[PDB]
Design a protein around this ligand. Structure first.
Ligand code: GRG
Length: 767
C-alpha cells in the first residue's frame, strides 16, 4: 500500500491534476543547470543588476547537502557535475553565494576525478554542454579540477565532431543542436541567422538555457520574453524544456489508460483530449503548443488516443516522417531515433482504418525495429522501471488479440512510480510518475477480483446441478470466466459475465458432442421445436445440454424482462430460443458436411460457417445485460448490422487460419482453406492462407472504423463495445503465443476445482 487516503480523496486529486493539464498547466521538476543559465541575464534597465534575482535565490536555497546541484533522489555524476558547474558559474558571475560556491567547488574537487565513460545516460548535448561549462568555470578562476583523462578525451572527441559539422547547415534547417546552442558559444555561428530558427514563442527547441545564450548573443526581444514568462510561470526555477503541454498531457492520460484507472476519470480525460485536439493538425504535433517541429512520438501518441476516443484524425500526419525504404524518423533530418517512439508508433499503427496504407508501413517498420533492440542493454540505467518489459509485451500482444485487464495487469507491474527522464539534465514528471496512480491501479485491480469468488461459486454450482458430469471437463469454465472478466470488468456487468459464461459453456458442450456424433436429425427434430416436452426422445448425452439450454433461456428471459420493461417476456424468449436454435442447427450443418463428402464453395461454406462460428450469438444474448436500452427494432436488425457481419467474418477467418494445420495433420477437408483451393486452381495452401490472412486484416480495419467512430444511427455504445470485445476474446483464444503462457487463470482453475470437490463430496471430507 502506497497511499493512505480514501479512494475518493485520490480520485479528487487526480481530477484536479487533469483539469490543470486541460488548461495547459502541468508539473516538471526545475533544472538547476537551466535556472542558473537563464539567471546569467542582466536587467535591461540596469545591466549591473540581474533580471532574475529570485532565480539566484532559488539556486542558493536548492543546493544539495553535499554541495552539488542536480537530481536529489538519483545521483548521476553527469547530472550533478554539469548542474553544479552551471550553478557555480552563475553565482560567481554575480559575486554572490560565497558559501554555496565553497560547497560547490569542494563537491567538484572530490568528484570530478570520478567521471568516466558508460556511467549513466548521455545527457542531451552533454558532449558540447559540459566542455563549454567547464571552460567557463576556468575563465572565472573557480577552484576545481580542470583536466582528467575523461575530460580531455571528451574535449578531444567533441572538437573533432564539431570540426566536421559544416556550420551553415546549423543556420539552414532545424537540427538538434538548436537545443544546446550554449555549448556552441565560441563557434563561428551567425547568431543573427540562427534567430530565424526560433519557435513561435521565441525559444530554441524550447530550451531555456539555449534560448538564453541566443538572447545574450543577439538581444532578440521574443527570446527574452519567452524566458521572462517561463520564469514567472515556473516560479523562477525553469525546467530544461518548456512548455511540454502536449507531451505531458498525452503521457498522463496514456499512463491512466494503460493502468486501467481511466474508469474514474472519463470527463476529465475528455477535457484534456479536447485541449490536445485544439492543437492537432494534418501534420501531427510536437511536444508543446509552441514547438518548432512535429515529431513522431507525440504524433503517434495523439493520433492513437484521439482516434480511440472518436476524434477525426488523419494518417496524413505520418507522411512527413517517411524515408525511402518504408522507414521512419522521429524528426525530419534526424540521424537516429529511440525505442519509446517506435513503441508508440507500433501501438498507433494498429488502430488503422481501411485504405490507410501508411500505417501498414509504420507497423512493419516499427515492428522490425522493436524485434531488433538490444534487450540486455536497453535502458540499462533503469530510468524506467521496465522499458524492455513494455517492448516485449507490445511485440507479443497484437491490439486485437489482447483484452483490457490483461494489458492493465501487465502494465501495473511495469509502471514506475518514481521513474526519471533524461534531457539536458535529469528531470521528473510527477504527474506521469507518482504513487497515487499506482495505488489507484492496485485498488481497482483488487475491486475486479472481489466479485469473482461468488460469481465463480455460482458457475460451479450451476455446472453441478445441471449434471454435465453425467455424459465432460469443467476446466472450460474458469477460462471462459477469465476472458469475460478481462473485457467487462466493472462490477455492474455481473449478469453479463455469468450469462455469457453459461452460454459459452452450453455451446462448447453441444458443439463438442456433435463434432463426434447420424441422428443429428433426431436432434435437429427436437431442437427445431425447442419443446422441453420432447426432451425425452433425446439420447441422454443430448438430453442433458438440451434441458439446461432450455432452462437457462427461461432464466435469461426472466432476468432480461426485469431489466427491459418495454420488452415482453415472450418477445425476449422467442428471441433467445430463436438465436440458439439457429446456431445449433447451423452447427449440425457444419457437422453433416464434415461426415459426408462435401467441400462446398467459399461463398456457400462461409455462409453457414459464419453463423456456425457461435460468436454472434453471445453478442445477441449479452446485449440484454449490457446496460443499454433496447427496442424490438434493435433486436430484429442487430444480426444484420455491419459490426455483426464483421464479427462473424473475422472470427471465421481467424478460426480457419489458426487451426488449418491442426486440421490437415489429420486430414480434414471442409474448411475455408480447402474451399478456397477448390475455387482457385494453382493456389497452393500457402496462397489460400495468405489470402485469408489478408482478408482478415482488411476486415479488422473495417471493424476499427465501425467501432472507434460514432456514426449516424449507430448501435448503442456498450453494444458496439461487446461486439468489439467478442471478436477479441475469440482472437486471443487463437493467439498461441499467449495461450501457452496462460497467473490469475491458474488460481481461477484451482478455486473452481476446490469448489467442485466440496460439491461432489456434499461437504463430507475424505483423506
Ligand atoms: C523519451 C521521450 C520522452 C521522448 C522522445 C521523443 C520526443 C520528441 C519527446 C518530446 C519531449 C521533449 C520536449 C524533448 C526535448 C529534449 C530531448 C532532446 C530529449 C531527448 O533526450 P534523449 O534521447 O534521452 O538524449 P540524447 O539526445 O542525449 O540522445
Amino acid at each position: 500500500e502506497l497511499d493512505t487516503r480514501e479512494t475518493s480523496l485520490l480520485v479528487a486529486e487526480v481530477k484536479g491534476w487533469l483539469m490543470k493539464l486541460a488548461s495547459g498547466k502541468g508539473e516538471i521538476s526545475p533544472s538547476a543547470y537551466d535556472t542558473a543559465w537563464v539567471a546569467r541575464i542582466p536587467s535591461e534597465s540596469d545591466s549591473s543588476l540581474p533580471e532574475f534575482p529570485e532565480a539566484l535565490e532559488w539556486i542558493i536555497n536548492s543546493q544539495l547537502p553535499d554541495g552539488s546541484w542536480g537530481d536529489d533522489r538519483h545521483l548521476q555524476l553527469y547530472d550533478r557535475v554539469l548542474s553544479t558547474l552551471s550553478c557555480l558559474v552563475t553565482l560567481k558571475t554575480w559575486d554572490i553565494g560565497h558559501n554555496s560556491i565553497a560547497q560547490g567547488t569542494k563537491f567538484l574537487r572530490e568528484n570530478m576525478i570520478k567521471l568516466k565513460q558508460d556511467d549513466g545516460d548521455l545527457l542531451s548535448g552533454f558532449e558540447v554542454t559540459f566542455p563549454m561549462m567547464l571552460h567557463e568555470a576556468k575563465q572565472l578562476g573557480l577552484d576545481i579540477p580542470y583536466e582528467t583523462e575523461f575530460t580531455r578525451l571528451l574535449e578531444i572527441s567533441t572538437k573533432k565532431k564539431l570540426a566536421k559539422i559544416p556550420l551553415d547547415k546549423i543556420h539552414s534547417a532545424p537540427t538538434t543542436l538548436l537545443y544546446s546552442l550554449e555549448g556552441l558559444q565560441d563557434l563561428e555561428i551567425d547568431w543573427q541567422k540562427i534567430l530565424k530558427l526560433q519557435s513561435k514563442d521565441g525559444s530554441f527547441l524550447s530550451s531555456p538555457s539555449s534560448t538564453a545564450c541566443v538572447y545574450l548573443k543577439t538581444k532578440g526581444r521574443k527570446s527574452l520574453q519567452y524566458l521572462q514568462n517561463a520564469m514567472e510561470d515556473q516560479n523562477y526555477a525553469v525546467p530544461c524544456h518548456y512548455p511540454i503541454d502536449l507531451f505531458e498531457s498525452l503521457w498522463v492520460v496514456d499512463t491512466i489508460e494503460r493502468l486501467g484507472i481511466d474508469v474514474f476519470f472519463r470527463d476529465e480525460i475528455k477535457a484534456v483530449l479536447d485541449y490536445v485536439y485544439s492543437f492537432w493538425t494534418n501534420e501531427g504535433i510536437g511536444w508543446g503548443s509552441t514547438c518548432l517541429v512535429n515529431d513522431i512520438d507525440d504524433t503517434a501518441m495523439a493520433f492513437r488516443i484521439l482516434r480511440m476516443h472518436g476524434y477525426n484524425v488523419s494518417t496524413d500526419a505520418f507522411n512527413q516522417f517517411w524515408l525511402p525504404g518504408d522507414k521512419f524518423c522521429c524528426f525530419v533530418g534526424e540521424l537516429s531515433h529511440g525505442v519509446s517512439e517506435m513503441l508508440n508508433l507500433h501501438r498507433a499503427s494498429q488502430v488503422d482504418f481501411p485504405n490507410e496504407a501508411i500505417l501498414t508501413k509504420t507497423f512493419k517498420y516499427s515492428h522490425d525495429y522493436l524485434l531488433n533492440v538490444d534487450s540486455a542493454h536497453m535502458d540499462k540505467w533503469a530510468t524506467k522501471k521496465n522499458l524492455m518489459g513494455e517492448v516485449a509485451f507490445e511485440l507479443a500482444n497484437p491490439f486485437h488479440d489482447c483484452l483490457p485487464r490483461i494489458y492493465n495487469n501487465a502494465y501495473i507491474k511495469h509502471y514506475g512510480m518514481d521513474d526519471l527522464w533524461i534531457a539536458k539534465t535529469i528531470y521528473r514528471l510527477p504527474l506521469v510518475n507518482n504513487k497515487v496512480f499506482l495505488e489507484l491501479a492496485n485498488r481497482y485491480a483488487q475491486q475486479c477480483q472481489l466479485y469473482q469468488p461468488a460469481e465463480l461459486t455460482k458457475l460451479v454450482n450451476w455446472w453441478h446441478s445441471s449434471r454435465f458430469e453425467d455424459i465432460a471437463n469443467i476446466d472450460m469454465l474458469p477460462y471462459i470466466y477469465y476472458v469475460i472478466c478481462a473485457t467487462f470488468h466493472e462490477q455492474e456487468f455481473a449478469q453479463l459475465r455469468v450469462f455469457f459464461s453459461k452460454a459459452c459453456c452450453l455451446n462448447t458442450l453441444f458443439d463438442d458432442l456433435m463434432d463426434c456424433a447420424e441422428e443429428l436429425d433426431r436432434l435437429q427434430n427436437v431442437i427445431e421445436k425447442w419443446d422441453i416436452s420432447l426432451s425425452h426422445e433425446l439420447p441422454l448425452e443430448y438430453r442433458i445440454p438440451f434441458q439446461e439450454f432450455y432452462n437457462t433461456v427461461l432464466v435469461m428471459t426472466e432476468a432480461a424482462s426485469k431489466i427491459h420493461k418495454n420488452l415482453s417476456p415472450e418477445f425476449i424468449c422467442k428471441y433467445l430460443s430463436g438465436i440458439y436454435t439457429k446456431l445449433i442447427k447451423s452447427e449440425i450443418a457444419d457437422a453433416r458436411w464434415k461426415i459426408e463428402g462435401y467441400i462446398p464453395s467459399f461463398e456457400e461454406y462461409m455462409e453457414n460457417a459464419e453463423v456456425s462460428i457461435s460468436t454472434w450469438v453471445h453478442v445477441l444474448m449479452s446485449i440484454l445485460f449490457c446496460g443499454e436500452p433496447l427496442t424490438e427494432e434493435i433486436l430484429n436488425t442487430i444480426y444484420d448490422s455491419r459490426p455483426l457481419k464483421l464479427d462473424r467474418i473475422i472470427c471465421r477467418l481467424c478460426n480457419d487460419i489458426q487451426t488449418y494445420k491442426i486440421e490437415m495433420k489429420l486430414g480434414q477437408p471442409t474448411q475455408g482453406v480447402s474451399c478456397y483451393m477448390k475455387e482457385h486452381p494453382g493456389a497452393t495452401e500457402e496462397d489460400a492462407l495468405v489470402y485469408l490472412q489478408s482478408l482478415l486484416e482488411k476486415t479488422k480495419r473495417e471493424l476499427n472504423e465501425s467501432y472507434f467512430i460514432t456514426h449516424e444511427n449507430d448501435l448503442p455504445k456498450n453494444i458496439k463495445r461487446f461486439n468489439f470485445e467478442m471478436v477479441r476474446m475469440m482472437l486471443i483464444t487463437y493467439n498461441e503465443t499467449r495461450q501457452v503462457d496462460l497467473n490469475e487463470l491458474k488460481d481461477m482453475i484451482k478455486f473452481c476445482l476446490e469448489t467442485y470437490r466440496t460439491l461432489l463430496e456434499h461437504h463430507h471430507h475424505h483423506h
